[PDB]
Every structure is written in C-alpha cells, then in structure tokens.
Design a protein around this ligand. Structure first.
Ligand SMILES: *C(=N)C1(NC(=O)[C@@H]2C[C@@H](S(=O)(=O)c3ccccc3Cl)CN2C(=O)C2(c3ccc(Br)cc3)CC2)CC1
Length: 219
C-alpha cells in the first residue's frame, strides 16, 4: 500500500457535517462511505441524506437518534432500492416519519463488506477502496476536546466502540517516536478538531478499536 493516502485530494469526500444533538453518527458514517463509493462509480460527488437513514431504517435495526450501525444503513439502501440526496431530504436532527421519495434517489448499494479486524487489513482497504466506515471508542473527554495532532488516549478500548466515523486516509507526521495516523472525518462540525477531522493513532494496537468494526458498501 502507499505510505500515505488522502481520498479528500481525489474528490471523494463531502465537507464536514454536523449531526447536532441526535445520536445519528452511524448515518453520517454511512453516507460518507456511500458518497465515496458513488463517486468512484460515477465521478459525481453528491451529498446524501442522513435524515433518510434516521427516519426510515428501523426495519433493518437502526434506532434513529438513539444509535445504529453502518451495516444496517447499507442494508437499508439495498432493501429500499435507493437513498435520497441531502438536498432533497435535508437534515433535521430529530427522528421523524419516513419521507423517502424514489424520484430523488441518487445512490444505491448492493450490500457491504466487513473488513478483517486488523489495522493492516484496514490500511489495504483504505488504499484500494476509498473512505471506510469505522467504529471507535470516542467515550473520553480527551476526544470531545481534541484540537490537533495525533490523538492517543491510553484508556481507549479496542473492543467497546460507541461512535461511527469515516476513515478517509492515513499517513505519518515527520516530527516523534510514534508518528502514524488514520485521517478520520467526524460529524461534529468544522469547529471540532482539525476542521472537523482527527488524526487517530495508527499501528498502536488497534487504538480505540478503529479496525474492530470497519466496513463499506458495494455499489
Ligand atoms: C452516534 N451518534 C452514537 N453512536 C452510535 O450509534 C454507535 C455507532 C455504532 S459503532 O460504530 O459504535 C459500532 C460499535 C460496535 C460494533 C459495530 C459498530 Cl459499527 C454503534 N453505536 C453504538 O453506540 C452502539 C449501538 C449498536 C447498535 C445499535 Br442498533 C445502536 C447502538 C452501542 C454500540 C449514538 C452515540
């Protein structure tokens, strides 16, 4: 694999969004991964509707503003035969009745791939596929108040993840002893972290569980 990857530079990634006070992180992770894969397929980057996921994917197991799984979201898109654009079905940050309209579907998927639970496998997937949905342990205030640099939290769990985010690349800082990172897009607005991104510690024993539940949709 390349020593560094950044899919933002290749046009795969929409600007950072803000889930607000709705527990819809999973929906933002899922739209980010699907935005990437649709861009690979068609050459068109189109922002996708998180609200469509929040309102409509209960049958697949998602719980609206009380949590969900990216793979359940990918299953919804396949079962449903589509997913509306962000423009057509804007974000409300509250769980509402399903308003999916197939006229404004701009994305599709045919299933999903769960990546083997190791960072070397995650790196291979990021290098070859595009942005990847991942689960992390975000349950420390060190993460809440992250500003810049490589995030490392000694108490982070590799097994107990509570936040879905998007790996858009990886690389290394030239600074000191530990310098590799995953480039991660969050859904907490541009104010948080590095314009909404966090450099998460890479190749340090699956830090925060970033390789424990990684997946992407097939298109
Ligand atoms: C986002 N605003 C919040 N977190 C979640 O919904 C979070 C996303 C995924 S995960 O990425 O943490 C994960 C964890 C374990 C295994 C796979 C994945 Cl993808 C699940 N989330 C959770 O917080 C849990 C969950 C699992 C399933 C359902 Br349905 C609801 C919630 C508790 C694991 C709401 C804060």
């Amino acid at each position: 694999a390349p020593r560094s990857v950044d899919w933002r530079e290749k046009g795969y990634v929409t600007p950072v969004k803000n889930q607000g006070q709705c527990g819809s992180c999973w929906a933002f992770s899922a739209t980010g991964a699907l935005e990437g894969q649709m861009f690979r397929k068609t050459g068109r980057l189109i922002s996708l509707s998180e609200q469509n996921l929040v309102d409509c994917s209960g049958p697949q197991g998602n719980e609206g503003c009380n949590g969900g799984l990216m793979d359940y979201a990918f299953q919804y898109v396949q079962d449903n035969g589509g997913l509306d654009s962000e423009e057509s079905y804007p974000y409300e940050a509250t769980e509402e009745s399903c308003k999916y309209n197939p006229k404004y579907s701009v994305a599709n998927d045919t299933g999903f791939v769960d990546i083997p639970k190791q960072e070397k496998a995650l790196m291979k997937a990021v290098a070859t596929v595009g942005p990847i949905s991942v689960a992390i342990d975000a349950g420390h205030e060190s993460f809440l108040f992250y500003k810049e640099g490589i995030y490392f939290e000694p108490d982070c769990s590799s097994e107990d993840m509570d936040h879905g985010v998007l790996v858009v690349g990886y690389g290394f800082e030239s600074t000191s002893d530990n310098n590799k990172y995953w480039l991660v897009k969050n859904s907490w607005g541009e104010e948080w972290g590095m314009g909404g991104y966090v450099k998460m510690a890479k190749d340090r024993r699956n830090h925060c569980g970033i390789a424990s539940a990684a997946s992407y949709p097939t298109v």
